[PDB]
Amino acid sequence: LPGEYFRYKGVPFPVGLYSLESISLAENTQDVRDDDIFIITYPKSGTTWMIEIICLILKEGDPSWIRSVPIWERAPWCETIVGASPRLMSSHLPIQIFTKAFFSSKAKVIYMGRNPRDVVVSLYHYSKIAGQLKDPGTPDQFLRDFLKGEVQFGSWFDHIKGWLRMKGKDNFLFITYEELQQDLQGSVERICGFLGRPLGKEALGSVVAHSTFSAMKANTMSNYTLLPPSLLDHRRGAFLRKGVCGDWKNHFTVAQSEAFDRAYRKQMRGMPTFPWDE
Numbered sequence: 378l379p380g381e382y383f384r385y386k387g388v389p390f391p392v393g394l395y396s397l398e399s400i401s402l403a404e405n406t407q408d409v410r411d412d413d414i415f416i417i418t419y420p421k422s423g424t425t426w427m428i429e430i431i432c433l434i435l436k437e438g439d440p441s442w443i444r445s446v447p448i449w450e451r452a453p454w455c456e457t458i459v460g461a462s463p464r465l466m467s468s469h470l471p472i473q474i475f476t477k478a479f480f481s482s483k484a485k486v487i488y489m490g491r492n493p494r495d496v497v498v499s500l501y502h503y504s505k506i507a508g509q510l511k512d513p514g515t516p517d518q519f520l521r522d523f524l525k526g527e528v529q530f531g532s533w534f535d536h537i538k539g540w541l542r543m544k545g546k547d548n549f550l551f552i553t554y555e556e557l558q559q560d561l562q563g564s565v566e567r568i569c570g571f572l573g574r575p576l577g578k579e580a581l582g583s584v585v586a587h588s589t590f591s592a593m594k595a596n597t598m599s600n601y602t603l604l605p606p607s608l609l610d611h612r613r614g615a616f617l618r619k620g621v622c623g624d625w626k627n628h629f630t631v632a633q634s635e636a637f638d639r640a641y642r643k644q645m646r647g648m649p650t651f652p653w654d655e
């Protein structure tokens with residue numbers, strides 16, 4: 378596994394987990410179903426968190442599933458070399474590469490968004506233990522590429538902007554990491570309402586408890602510890618790092634934090650105020 382990028386229709390992808398073949402199949406496939414469910418996010422936004430929350434919702438709270446099966450098998454990524462009823466799938470693809478057949482179908486999509494800053498810190502560390510990804514290199518340089526969209530999947534800015542074009546639609550829910558972080562149980566109900574799958578105190582309360590950071594970091598099937606070191610280095614670090622809101626303040630120097638606001642301002646021009654925007 379090289380740890381290099383290749384490009385598809387102009388977008389950067391990691392060698393190995395992805396290939397021209399896979400991405401295409403995902404873009405141009407026809408297998409999209411009315412009851413299918415898609416989790417779509419930009420890496421390090423907390424996909425995993427959601428991938429679990431939903432798995433619990435599905436089984437009304439029976440941890441059975443999330444205990445027995447890994448996570449990359451409960452909500453399989455479309456674009457990956459090994460792409461996927463009721464089907465739960467996930468994708469990091471930008472709106473212009475995602476499965477087209479989607480747009481005309483009644484399928485459901487939950488876009489999760491995270492504070493761009495934390496997403497970088499989060500990606501920084503991960504890259505160090507990720508087999509498919511090249512090592513961070515100097516901080517600044519890493520931050521320069523992120524803002525420049527010179528990383529796997531391209532600009533975080535483009536991604537969230539493009540996808541948000543689905544806001545307004547009823548087969549599309551947009552939610553942020555911060556929200557789950559703020560009121561997880563609330564979010565759970567919401568994401569439940571969105572999927573036409575209600576739960577009783579018992580069920581909901583279960584999903585809540587089982588979705589918590591600690592809980593998940595405690596579940597082998599969910600903490601990625603079962604991946605082959607040739608993709609994650611267990612001896613070094615962990616996929617579920619801290620799991621908190623605003624760890625960016627402990628990484629960015631003011632200089633970087635300012636330059637970021639700059640780039641961010643000249644990119645999120647007239648976007649609505651996001652949770653994290655202070």
Ligand SMILES: Nc1ncnc2c1ncn2[C@@H]1O[C@H](COP(=O)(O)O)[C@@H](OP(=O)(O)O)[C@H]1O
Pocket residue numbers: 418419420421422423424425426498499500502588589590591593616617618619620621624
């Ligand atoms: N239940 C949970 N609660 C809080 N953060 C969670 C979480 N499950 C995963 N995460 C965090 O989501 C990030 C990875 O998401 P993704 O699946 O998109 O790559 C990591 O951020 P950190 O590096 O800050 O710990 C990870 O710890």
Ligand code: NA
Pocket residue numbers: 380504505506507508509510511512
């Ligand atoms: Na690496």
